[PDB]
């Protein structure tokens, strides 16, 4: 077993999130967001039509040149 992995921290609020369900930016390993911070990003970005990386840096989908966006099902899980 394991008591805990090495510490990993929310990019925006600095809270520990290793070994939890959190949002991992596909193309930037250090971009990690807890669900509370992600909820804020979804609400603030939602009016544009798409929700991109909560860092605001429009990080790409891996292998592509366009920013990755949340899926509807992920928004549902995060807002639950």
């Amino acid at each position: 077993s394991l008591a805990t992995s090495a510490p990993l921290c929310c990019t925006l609020c600095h809270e520990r999130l290793e070994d939890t369900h959190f949002v991992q930016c596909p193309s930037v390993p250090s971009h990690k967001f807890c669900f509370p911070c992600s909820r804020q990003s979804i609400k603030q970005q939602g009016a544009s039509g798409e929700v991109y990386c909560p860092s605001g840096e429009k990080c790409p989908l891996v292998g592509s040149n366009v920013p990755w966006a949340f899926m509807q099902g992920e928004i549902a899980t995060i807002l639950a």
């Binding site: 991992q24 596909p26 989908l61 990755w68 949340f70 899926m71 099902g73 992920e74 899980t77």
Partner: peptide, 6 residues
Amino acid sequence: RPSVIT
């Protein structure tokens, strides 16, 4: 992509 939710 896989889900962004870990």
